[PDB]
Amino acid sequence: TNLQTFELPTEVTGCAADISLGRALIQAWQKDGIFQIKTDSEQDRKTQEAMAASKQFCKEPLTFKSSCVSDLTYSGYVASGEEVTAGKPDFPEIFTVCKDLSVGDQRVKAGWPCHGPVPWPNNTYQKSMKTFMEELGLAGERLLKLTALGFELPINTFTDLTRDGWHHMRVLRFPPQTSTLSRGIGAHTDYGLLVIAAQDDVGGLYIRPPVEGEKRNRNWLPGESSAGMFEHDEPWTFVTPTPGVWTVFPGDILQFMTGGQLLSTPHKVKLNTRERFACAYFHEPNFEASAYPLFESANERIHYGEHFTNMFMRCYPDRITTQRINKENRLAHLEDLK
């Protein structure tokens, strides 16, 4: 399937044109599971600078890369083969950028799970990634206003959840395939409101569109992980690399809040004949936000930070971050926040 591309206005005000655009965005997700947004010169420049920083960092020796880790936050380095999806190793190397909180921050002092300072490789890499993430966040907020408008909801419905949102980014390098291994990342869904992603010209992202009659697991429930689901089953859409766009698809929270009117798009990565750089950005609720059903009055909620924490613990069962959460009973804070 050949994807739709939209140009977003710099500001979303709720004018009648914004409602029509929002309607189109929703309908593109309901048809294809994904759409593209055009990038302007600055958005593209910041994307390329981040990609270049990623390539330069990956050239560092492994001993140095592996030192960029923290027992407070999941930010930092993930070696190729380290992450687990559905019990199988994923092959990118990754640098994850979560909210960059100093040890003087009150949430860090209180010992909240996943809160702490990014173990940056250096200040030059830091600046490239922070500038990119700030730009990505402006796009996320436009998209959330448009999504609310397309559902004829109050314009701030989703952005009210993203104040000091737990936005984060996975800066990825996928190695080349071998004749017997081509799994980059197993099939999965991501966890928050939106996923905005950039990729180089190599290719390897596949997404699953909505399928009439197909039951979808609710990955915010422990008994219904979406990891590995549909891995070997049609249909999978190849997201062809296209110059001058970012891709956008929903995460688990949007699926929950919309009652399945939007689905959290399953996706996976195949290793190609060349190494592949990509960046995946997650526009998320505040860690303390409680997502709720928009169209139902049911009692179910998703505590976003609980979902993030549960997911990252399953991704990284042996990481020092996970060990410290378990040792210090940091999950108790979530019970308290709830």
Ligand SMILES: NC(=[NH2+])NCCC[C@H](N)C(=O)O
């Ligand atoms: N941290 C991530 N977004 N990881 C994406 C891959 C899927 C992840 N390993 C999982 O089990 O859910």
Ligand SMILES: O=C(O)CNC(=O)C(=O)O
């Ligand atoms: O590499 C890509 O284009 C897709 N990346 C992801 O889905 C991810 O890391 O969660």
Ligand SMILES: [Fe+3]
């Ligand atoms: Fe993903």
